[PDB]
Amino acid sequence: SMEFPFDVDALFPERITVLDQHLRPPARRPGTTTPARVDLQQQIMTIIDELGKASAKAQNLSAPITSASRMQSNRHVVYILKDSSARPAGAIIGFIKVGYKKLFVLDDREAHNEVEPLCILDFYIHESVQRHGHGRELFQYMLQKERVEPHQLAIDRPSQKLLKFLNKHYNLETTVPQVNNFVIFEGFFAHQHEFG
């Protein structure tokens, strides 16, 4: 999939790496690798920049919606999928980016609600390996770490591929019409209904 000069496996030991505005390299014990020629955080910044550009090309966007500089100035969390057993040994498969956002969301009565749901903001799997289950790997990992259910999410400008994905995997089919270009599904307001 996506190839980089520096040692990705040394940088990201785990299959899925979780980063936020700090862009902090995963933990490592002193001595377990020689200090790289490129600082670890610079490697991370380059990876985020390139992933965001690739996602923008996939989505036919004139500018990336994910980048190192945007990560540093926002409250977003990115989950990055890498294959530790890739061949030939070196690569990054893709990522999902989420964040809580304050939104004014319409309910099924067309009334406005001030809410702060977890939002799906950017999501990309390299073209060569789309439709192989990697998107679901990332999505599931994120749901588990964030402790949220699919119907509780808002989606920023979902693509056709993502709408199909959400219906297939999570039975998210029926939307509640919005004016803010986010999409929500039936069940979005269930928690508000129960708890207030």
Ligand SMILES: CC(=O)SCCNC(=O)CCNC(=O)[C@H](O)C(C)(C)COP(=O)(O)OP(=O)(O)OC[C@H]1O[C@@H](n2cnc3c(N)ncnc32)[C@H](O)[C@@H]1OP(=O)(O)O
């Ligand atoms: C808020 C946002 O991020 S909107 C932008 C979402 N990102 C994009 O559209 C970028 C291009 N697409 C991708 O990167 C990926 O296809 C993702 C992230 C949408 C999904 O990840 P994938 O690894 O492809 O999904 P995964 O293999 O886990 O699940 C497959 C399902 O996704 C949907 N899907 C994936 N590719 C396609 C496709 N080319 N056409 C129609 N549906 C598709 C289908 O529901 C499919 O199931 P099916 O094969 O039985 O029809």
Ligand SMILES: [Cl-]
């Ligand atoms: Cl694509």
Ligand SMILES: [Cl-]
């Ligand atoms: Cl970002």
Ligand SMILES: [Cl-]
């Ligand atoms: Cl609802």
